[PDB]
Design a protein around this nucleic acid. Structure first.
Lengths: 80, 92, 62
DNA sequence: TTCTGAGCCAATCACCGAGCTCGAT
DNA sequence: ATCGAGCTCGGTGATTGGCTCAGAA
């Protein structure tokens, strides 16, 4: 039911010059992966929003989840 | 390079974000913009491992196994089954 | 910007090459440094054109 | 407290997906 | 043979901003 542009997921993978041909199944997997990712990042960040007694989730909520989870370590110079 | 060429649509991102939270809740623009950047990094991140392992096996096309393997390699091993599962209800 | 095993062990080496990839795109290609207010000239002109109801919203029938 | 910034509407049109042709494995 | 890049084409949902008061400060 959910969705995300497959074409766009591809366009993004193909930013890399080393990445030349891509199977059909791949974006399809990524659609769902990104969906789980975006889902479980937000979920984590919101804790930090409630912790602080806000009702708006904000940039810095996010950074505060990234710093508190090893699996997300790869975004470090993404969000300083 | 345009924004539309390198990020997922913001409204698609917000939609999902908004699902993850109290229905009453709110989200900063800068917050959405941010996850949007992340998700794009996440896409690129798995790929470069997959591209490494995929060219390392003397192939030219990044496929299913490639991703999943890359995910195990980088600690997303938890995502692995639910994808596989979701990978059996859309293909033939 | 630099560090050793003070990050997920599993992930370390990738982060590193992906730093390289970007530092390339930055140096050479085109990574937009800042966000644009809007994305398409036409969708801007159209949003500016739309009749608006009360509250600055779009409208709806009555 | 003061005052910044997110949600709310839905109509156009850029972009996505479903068809293709062609060249590779 | 199968399976992907790259066109084209037509159908459609992301994109879009002004006023108001949640709610960040």
């Amino acid at each position: 039911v959910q969705e995300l542009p497959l074409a766009r997921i591809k366009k993004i993978m193909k930013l890399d010059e080393d990445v030349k041909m891509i199977s059909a199944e791949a974006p399809v997997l990524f659609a769902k992966a990104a969906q789980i990712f975006i889902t479980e990042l937000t979920l984590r960040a919101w804790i930090h929003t409630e912790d602080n007694k806000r009702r708006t989730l904000q940039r810095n909520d996010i950074a505060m989840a990234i710093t508190k989870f090893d699996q997300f370590d790869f975004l470090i110079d993404i969000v300083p | 390079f345009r924004e539309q060429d390198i990020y997922l649509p913001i409204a698609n991102v917000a939609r999902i974000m908004k699902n993850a939270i109290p229905q009453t809740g709110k989200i900063a623009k800068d917050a959405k913009e941010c996850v949007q950047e992340c998700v794009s990094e996440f896409i690129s991140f798995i790929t470069s491992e997959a591209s490494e392992r995929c060219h390392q096996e003397k192939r030219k096309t990044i496929n299913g196994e490639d991703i999943l393997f890359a995910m195990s390699t980088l600690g997303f091993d938890s995502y692995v089954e639910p994808l596989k599962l979701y990978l059996q209800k859309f293909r033939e | 910007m630099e560090e050793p095993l003070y990050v997920n062990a599993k992930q370390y080496h990738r982060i590193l090459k992906r730093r390289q990839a970007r530092a390339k795109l930055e140096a050479e290609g085109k990574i937009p440094k800042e966000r644009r207010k809007y994305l398409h000239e036409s969708r801007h002109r159209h949003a500016m054109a739309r009749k608006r109801g009360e509250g600055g919203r779009f409208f709806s029938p009555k």
